[PDB]
C-alpha cells in the first residue's frame, strides 16, 4: 500500500550531521548517554500527562528503558515506555528541528554540552525509529544520513502500544558497542545516575 512518505533533510540538519559524522571522535560513546537522555525525557513527559489523564499510562503501565545488542543484525536498540511520537513529531521534531542550542554549538567549535539524538550517527551508518504515541498510530522513521529520510505508517507486525525503539545499525568498526563488558560498564557509567531503570539484555551463545 506504500504508507512511506519519503522526505528530505533540513539544510542545516545536514550540516549538523556532517559535523558529527565527519569528525573522528575518540569516544563516540557520547551517543548512548544522549539517547538515554531523550528517553528519560519521554518517560518523564508520559508520566506527566498520566496525572491529568490516567488513560495514558494504561498502554504500558510501567516505565522502563531497554538496551538490546543483537549480534545477529549488528544492531544496538534503545527502548522505552515513554511518550512516543505522532507522524508530526516524527517529521517535525526529528528531521526538521535544530535541537535547541544552534549548530553554532559545533560551528563555533571550528575556531560535550549535548548533541542529542543525532549523536547516534557516529557509531551507525543507518538508524530506524519505531514509535507509538497514544493519539496516533505506530510510525517508522529511517535515514542513512544521506540527506533524505522516510516516515512510514506501521500498522502491521508488532506494536509497542506506547513509546519508542531506536535501532541503530552499527558501522563495521563500531561493533564494540555490541559487547556486554562495554555496555554493562556504560549502564553503570555516565547517565547511570538518573530517574528510571536501565535493563541491559544480551544473547547467551
Ligand atoms: N525517545 C524519544 N521519544 C520520543 N520523542 C523523541 C525521543 N527522542 C527524541 N525525540 C523527539 O525528537 C526531537 C529532537 O531530537 P534531539 O535529540 O535533536 O533534541 P532533544 O529535544 O532530544 C534535546 P537534545 O538536543 O539535548 O537531545 C525531540 O525534541 C523529541 O521531540
**What residue has cell string 543483537?**
70
Q: Best of 40, 79, 86, 93 to mutate for ligand 1, by most ligand atoms within 8 A of CB? A: 93
- Concatenating the DSSP letter of every residue in the chain gives ---EEEEE--HHHHHHHHHHHTS--S--THHHHHHHHHHHHHHHHHHHHHHH-STTTTSS-S--EEEEEETTTTEEEEEE-S----HHHIIIIITS---SS-THHHHTT-------GGGGGGTEEEEEEEEE-SSS-EEEEEE-SSSEEEEEE--SS---SSEEEEEEEE-TT-GGGG-HHHHHHHHHSTT-SSSS-EEE-----
Question: Is the distance from CB of 167 to CB of 127 less than 8 angstroms?
Answer: yes
- Please state, in angstroms and rounded to a whole number, the distance separating the CA atoms of residues 85 and 137: 9
Say what the resolution is, in angstroms: 3.1
List ligand 1's pocket residues with C-beta within 6 A.
37-39, 42, 80, 82-85, 89, 93-94, 97, 99-100, 114, 116-118, 164
CA distances (Å), origin 19, targets 5, 30, 81, 109, 138: 27, 14, 31, 10, 31
Q: Which domains can be identified in the chain, with CATH numbers?
A: 1-205 (3.30.565.10)
- 193 annotated ligand-binding residue: no
Distance of CA 117 from the midpoint of ligand 1 (Å): 6
Q: Are strands 198-200 and 65-70 parallel, antiparallel or unpaired?
A: parallel
**Residue 128 main-chain phi, psi, to 5 deg:** -130, 135
Distance of CA 53 to the CA centre of its chain: 26
- Please state, in angstroms and rounded to a whole number, the distance separating the CA atoms of residues 61 and 48: 13
Which residues fall within 8 angstroms of residue 139, CB to CB, at 6 or more apart? 85, 86, 87, 90, 130, 131, 151, 152, 153, 154
Amino acid at each position: 500500500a506504500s504508507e512511506t512518505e519519503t522526505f528530505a533533510f533540513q539544510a542545516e540538519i545536514n550540516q549538523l550531521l556532517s559535523l558529527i559524522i565527519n569528525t573522528f571522535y575518540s569516544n563516540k560513546e557520547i551517543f548512548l548517554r544522549e539517547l538515554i537522555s531523550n528517553s528519560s525525557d519521554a518517560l518523564d513527559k508520559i508520566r506527566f500527562e498520566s496525572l491529568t489523564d490516567k488513560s495514558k499510562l494504561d498502554a504500558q503501565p510501567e516505565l522502563f528503558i531497554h538496551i538490546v545488542p543483537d549480534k545477529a543484525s549488528n544492531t544496538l536498540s534503545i527502548i522505552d515506555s515513554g511518550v512516543g511520537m505522532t507522524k508530526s513529531d516524527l517529521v517535525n521534531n526529528l528531521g526538521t528541528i535544530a535541537r535547541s542550542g544552534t549548530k553554532e554549538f559545533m560551528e563555533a567549535l571550528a575556531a560535550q554540552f549535548g548533541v542529542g539524538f543525532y549523536s547516534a550517527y557516529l557509531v551507525a551508518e543507518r538508524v530506524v525509529v519505531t514509535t507509538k504515541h497514544n493519539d496516533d498510530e505506530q510510525y517508522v522513521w529511517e535515514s542513512q544520513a544521506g540527506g533524505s529520510f522516510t516516515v512510514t505508517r506501521d500498522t502491521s507486525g508488532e506494536q509497542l502500544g506506547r513509546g519508542t525503539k531506536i535501532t541503530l545499525y552499527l558501522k563495521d568498526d563500531q561493533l564494540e558497542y555490541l559487547e556486554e563488558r562495554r555496555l554493562k560498564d556504560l549502564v553503570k557509567k555516565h547517565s547511570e545516575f538518573i530517574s528510571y531503570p536501565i535493563s541491559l539484555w544480551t544473547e547467551k551463545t
